[PDB]
Amino acid sequence: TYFITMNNARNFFIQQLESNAQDTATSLGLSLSQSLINHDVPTMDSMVKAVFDRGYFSSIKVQDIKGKVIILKKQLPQESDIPQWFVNLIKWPSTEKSSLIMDGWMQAGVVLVASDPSYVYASLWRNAVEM
Amino acid sequence: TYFITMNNARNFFIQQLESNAQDTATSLGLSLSQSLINHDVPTMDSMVKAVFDRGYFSSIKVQDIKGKVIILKKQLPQESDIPQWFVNLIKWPSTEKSSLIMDGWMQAGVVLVASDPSYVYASLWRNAVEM
């Protein structure tokens, strides 16, 4: 039988969650351009909600140049039946990734996507085997 | 030391690659709407290239109602230093996911995203431990 060490599986999720937040922010940066320029909040909300409803993100933030937050989706990590000792073994901090929302060559806004590491803890706990 | 079985790690990637292709297709479906309506091929190409340059996809296809392919990005799985016996152990077929490109309530096109399972084989091979 073949296995993967917990340490290597953890390194995958650390890297995957970080790059997924960046890739998501970059694609939202292109997707939101026209709606941000024309101040179409409902269209911007649909694009963000489609991404945030995936469930992997702790926060998604859209703001114009000044820092004026236009859209803000947030969720907390919630209660867990995972033992705290195992949570302390695998946990790692969340990282926020950004991408500029452009209007041609001019800056128009920023979209920020933050990962939710606690989204993966339960799957690592249920699939863990000790040897 | 904690481990994950190869079978459980494989089930994760089977599920993750399939849902990632679907989530990507759905977000592209919203992102490409205005450009498809106004027939802005360069803007559509930038949105697709940002997603396809990620490297996880075997193909991304944008077409109007009729099946007229507007954008087509493809890549083959390439040569591997992975032994064929291990490739046969973990391999699984690619799946194509679709999302409609809408213009309000009217249909305008379809975007199709296909996964590339062979993208993950090398990482599973380099991280594999037998017990």
Author numbering:
A (entry chain A), B (entry chain A): 22 to 152
The authors write:
LapD is a c-di-GMP receptor that translates changes in the concentration of this cytosolic second messenger into cell-surface events via an inside-out signaling mechanism that ultimately controls cell adhesion. Specifically, c-di-GMP-bound LapD engages the periplasmic protease LapG through its Per-Arnt-Sim (PAS)-like domain, preventing it from cleaving the cell surface-bound large adhesin LapA, a protein mediating cell adhesion to multiple substrates. In contrast, c-di-GMP-unbound LapD adopts an autoinhibited conformation and loses its affinity for LapG. To address these shortcomings, we report here two structures, that of the output domain of a LapD ortholog from L. pneumophila, also known and referred to here as CdgS9, and that of LapG in complex with the same output domain.
The structure of L. pneumophila CdgS9Output (residues of 22–152) was determined from data collected on a crystal grown from selenomethionine-derivatized protein by using single anomalous dispersion (SAD) phasing (see ‘Material and methods’). The asymmetric unit contains one molecule of CdgS9Output, which adopts a PAS-like domain fold with the highest structural homology to CitA. A potential biologically relevant dimer involves a crystallographic symmetry mate, burying 3020 Å2 surface area at the twofold symmetry axis via favorable interactions (estimated ΔGint = −20.2 kcal/mol). The protomers form a parallel dimer, with the termini lining up at one end of the complex, consistent with their connectivity to the transmembrane helices that flank the periplasmic domain. CdgS9Output adopts a ‘parallel’ conformation as opposed to the open, V-shaped form that we observed in case of LapDOutput. As a consequence, the tryptophan residues (W125 in P. fluorescens LapD; W126 in L. pneumophila CdgS9) that form the distal tip of the PAS fold and appear to be a main anchor point for LapG binding are farther apart in the P. fluorescens dimer than the L. pneumophila LapD ortholog (50 Å vs 35 Å between their respective Cβ positions). Taken together, the cross-linking data clearly indicate that the topology observed in the CdgS9Output structure represents the biologically relevant model, which is conserved in the two LapD orthologs, LapD and CdgS9, despite only moderate overall sequence conservation (31% identity/52% similarity). In the apo-state, the output domain dimer of CdgS9 contains central four-helix bundles, either via packing of helices α1 and α2 of the PAS domain fold close to the distal end, or helices α1 and α4 at the membrane-proximal region. Closer to the membrane, a cluster of 4 phenylalanine residues (2 per protomer; F33 and F34 of CdgS9) stack in a perpendicular fashion, as opposed to the packing near the distal tip, which involves the burying of two symmetry-related arginine residues (R75 of CdgS9). High-affinity LapG binding to the off-state of LapD is prevented by an apparent surface mismatch.
